[PDB]
């Protein structure tokens, strides 16, 4: 599959990212820091192998 040179996608794959996902677009882009934890246990995904 997909190859990437890891130093950017902020110029090389804003066809990806959470920011991007915001559609907040273009920047190396900070995360201030800033808060509270998570995890799950679960997925609820369709069925990965489904078909």
């Amino acid at each position: 599959g997909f190859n990437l040179k890891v130093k950017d996608l902020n110029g090389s794959a804003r066809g990806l990212t959470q920011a991007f996902a915001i559609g907040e677009l273009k920047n190396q882009l900070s995360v201030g820091a800033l808060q509270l934890p998570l995890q799950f246990t679960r997925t609820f995904s369709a069925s990965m192998t489904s078909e």
Binding site: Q28, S30, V31, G32, A33, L34
Partner: protein, 51 residues
């Protein structure tokens, strides 16, 4: 020559007061927030993986 040391001692104590209260979560977290942030600016800047 004599007097100093004693004068020194207490300082440390002072210090001792302070860090001591500096430990406290609500403190510490604060640090936390900081560090991250400190780092954040830093991140562009920083380059060396000096260990």
């Amino acid at each position: 020559l004599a007097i100093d040391g004693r004068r020194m001692q207490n300082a440390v104590t002072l210090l001792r007061k302070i860090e001591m209260i500096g430990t406290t979560g609500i403190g510490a977290s604060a640090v936390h927030l900081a560090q991250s942030r400190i780092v954040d600016q830093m991140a562009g800047r920083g380059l060396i993986d000096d260990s």
